[PDB]
Structures are given as C-alpha cells and as structure tokens.
Write a protein that binds this ligand. Structure first.
Ligand code: 45D
Length: 307
C-alpha cells in the first residue's frame, strides 16, 4: 500500500460532494453578495439551532483585532469584511490567516453578534442579492444541517490572505486542553467492530488524549479529513489533532471489518459526530475508513461527511 492507494478503500462510500459544489458556486459571487448570503443563511439557521459561543480563553489571539473592528466606523468595518472575503492583502487579512479554524469561527461569531446588536455595520436593509446569489442561498437553506454548517465553516476558513505568500509565519491555535478527567470518560461500542485499535482511536479522540492517540499510527501514517488531502506523518497529524480536533464527540454506531492485502485490515465505521460549536444540535453523519497494518497500527484513516 501507498497513501494514494489507501485512499480508495470502500470506494462505494458516498460523500457529500454537494458541500464543495456549493462552495464553488459561492466563490463566483461578489464580496457583498457573499457577506449578505451568509448573513441570511445564518439568521435562518438560528431559528432552530444555536451556536455555543466559545470561551474567551480560546479567543486570546483574536481579541485585540476584534476590538479594533468594533471601534472602527461602519464604512471601515464593511471594508474589513470585504477584504477578508476577497482574500485581500491587508494587515487584518494577513493576521486572520495565521488563525486556526476555530479562532476564525469565533471571530465571525463575534462580528455576527455585533451585527445583530448594531455595533458592527449590518447588512443594508432592503439588500438585493443577484439572481445567482439568490439561487445559492436557497440551495444552502435546503442542505441538511450537517452539510450547512460545513459549507459555512469552509467559507469562513478560506477567507483571509493566501497563506502561501506570507512565507514563514507562526500558525496560532486555541490552548491545548488537558486530557479528559479519567472518571469523566466514556467507552464506545460499535455494532460489528471490536478491533482494539479502532476503539482506542474513538475513545482517545473523545477524551482529547492526543499523545496516546498519535501512538496508534505508523510513523508514515496519514489522516484525511473530509474534502481535504491526506495529512501525512505523526508530526503533522498530531499538529492537526491539537489545532482542529479538540472537544469533539464521536458516536460511532456500526461497522464492518474485512481483510486487505498482506494481512492488512480495512474497516469502515459509520456514525455521528458532534462539534462543540453546536453540541447535540447538529449530529453530522460520518464514515471512517481505516487501513490497519498486521501489527494493529493505523496506516491510513479517512473521515467522510456522508451525502
Ligand atoms: C462569515 C459570516 C458570518 C458569520 C458566520 C458564522 C459565525 C458561521 C459559524 C459557522 C460555524 C460556527 C460552523 C462550524 C462547523 C463545525 C464543523 C463543521 C465540524 C467538523 C468536525 C468534524 C466533522 C469531526 C471531524 C473529525 C473526526 C470525526 C475524526 O475522526 C478525526 C478528526 C476530524 C476533525 C477530521 C456573518 C453572519 C457575520 C455574515 C457575514 C459572513 O460572511
């Protein structure tokens, strides 16, 4: 096996490629239409589900820029949001690109709160979307909740100046929370799968115990998040666990295990995952595809958002 051939296990797994499809339609619109479309989608979503605000401890790297935006005049505030949306080269747009996904989301959550109470320049009353933007908004409102919040997250994440041409820069993330209190941990069960490596992957992720979790991988192993390329090697995979994978709740329900070539094992689990942004408000339907070597170490795992 190679990582590239490991990618193809269980090829009838149908992922939700409506998500990148919708994002690409979104990318065709004007900056102002993009901001207004998301505002209208956000407001509609808030009728039924509520974002859990992040702790102030996780926003320490964004706090000063956020207060700067609030104190700006309305026209400056609108220009900052447009700059981010167009991925313009401005100081705020560069700083934004050094932030982890959760810091970026908290930044836009705070702006959205301030747009509601009138502190930040709101979407003009009687704003009219272009016909193409109107079609995108309706499409987004039609997606199931798990796919809706993934479109919204991926829009937020892709804003800011292109990371490729700020060169050497420190990527910044939320504090690394200590592993969960032992008495506070739960024990997953999976109908049809008792493989100890897969159970330990689930339990350690649910406990935020990334030092233990990373030891489940081969040194050259890889993890592939939904709609992304594989992250290769223990060092990069551990950075991703710390930067992006804290406070998830994984609820695998059932799975199947099959031999693969050379005493490898290929395992597919389906279930739900909750993000801390929404808790039980949004249960995302996920698949996990593991390729495990004869010693029981993860050579490859893909995580798919299901159609
Ligand atoms: C932007 C904007 C707005 C503001 C908007 C906002 C504030 C939008 C906020 C949108 C939010 C808060 C979106 C969050 C989604 C969290 C997601 C998809 C998680 C996936 C985690 C997963 C699948 C589990 C993943 C995984 C498991 C299972 C593993 O096994 C391994 C790990 C891994 C992570 C791969 C305004 C409203 C101001 C209007 C203007 C405007 O543009």
């Amino acid at each position: 096996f190679t990582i590239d051939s490991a990618r193809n296990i269980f090829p009838n797994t149908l992922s939700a490629d409506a998500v990148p499809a919708t994002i690409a339609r979104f990318s065709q619109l004007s900056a102002e239409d993009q901001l207004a479309l998301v505002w209208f989608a956000y407001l509609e979503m808030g009728k039924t589900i509520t974002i859990a605000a992040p702790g102030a401890a996780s926003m320490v790297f964004a706090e000063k820029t956020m207060n700067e935006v609030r104190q700006m005049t309305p026209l400056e505030q609108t220009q900052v949001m447009c700059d981010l949306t167009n991925r313009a080269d401005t100081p705020i747009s560069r700083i934004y690109s050094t932030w982890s996904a959760n810091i970026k989301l908290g930044f836009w959550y705070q702006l959205g709160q301030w747009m509601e109470d009138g502190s930040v320049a709101p979407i003009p009353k009687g704003y009219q979307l272009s016909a193409n933007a109107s079609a995108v908004l309706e499409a987004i409102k039609k997606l199931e909740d798990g796919q809706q919040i993934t479109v919204l997250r991926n829009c937020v994440v892709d804003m800011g100046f292109d990371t490729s041409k700020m060169g050497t820069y420190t990527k910044v993330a939320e504090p690394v929370v200590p592993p969960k209190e032992m008495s506070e941990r739960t024990k997953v069960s999976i109908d049809g799968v008792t493989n100890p490596t897969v159970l330990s992957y689930m339990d350690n992720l649910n406990a935020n115990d990334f030092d233990v979790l990373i030891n489940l991988f081969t040194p050259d192993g890889a993890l592939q998040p939904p709609f992304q390329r594989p992250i290769v090697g223990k060092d990069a995979v551990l950075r991703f666990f710390k930067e992006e994978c804290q406070n998830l709740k994984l609820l695998p329900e059932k799975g199947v295990s099959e031999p693969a070539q050379d005493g490898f094992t290929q395992i597919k689990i389906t279930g739900k995952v909750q993000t801390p942004w929404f808790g039980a408000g949004v249960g995302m339907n996920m698949a996990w595809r593991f390729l495990i070597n004869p010693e029981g170490k993860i050579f490859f795992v893909a995580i798919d958002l299901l159609a």
